């Protein structure tokens, strides 16, 4: 977030399949629709994967 809210805006890339926070960007990648529009089942599965 410090990279993104920055002048110039830093491009960033996330790798998948490893584990932990990168994968909860991956679930914030393929099921996202129009940017940050995230539904309730996916936010709750995300919450329990942070809790696990």
């Amino acid at each position: 977030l410090e990279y993104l809210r920055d002048t110039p805006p830093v491009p960033v890339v996330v790798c998948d399949g490893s584990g932990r926070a990168s994968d909860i960007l991956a679930f914030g990648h393929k099921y996202s629709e129009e940017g940050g529009l995230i539904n309730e089942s996916l936010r709750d599965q995300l919450l329990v994967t942070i809790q696990k």
């Binding site: 089942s41 709750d44 599965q45 329990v48």
Partner: peptide, 30 residues
């Protein structure tokens, strides 16, 4: 038939992804 292996086990893999989401939700539901 290795071509056929690759595509059919691809179907098995994505189907199991749906099954994982369903069973984790069911475990949350119990």
């Amino acid at each position: 038939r290795v071509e056929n292996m690759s595509m059919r086990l691809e179907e098995v893999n994505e189907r199991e992804h749906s099954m994982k989401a369903s069973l984790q939700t069911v475990d949350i539901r119990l």
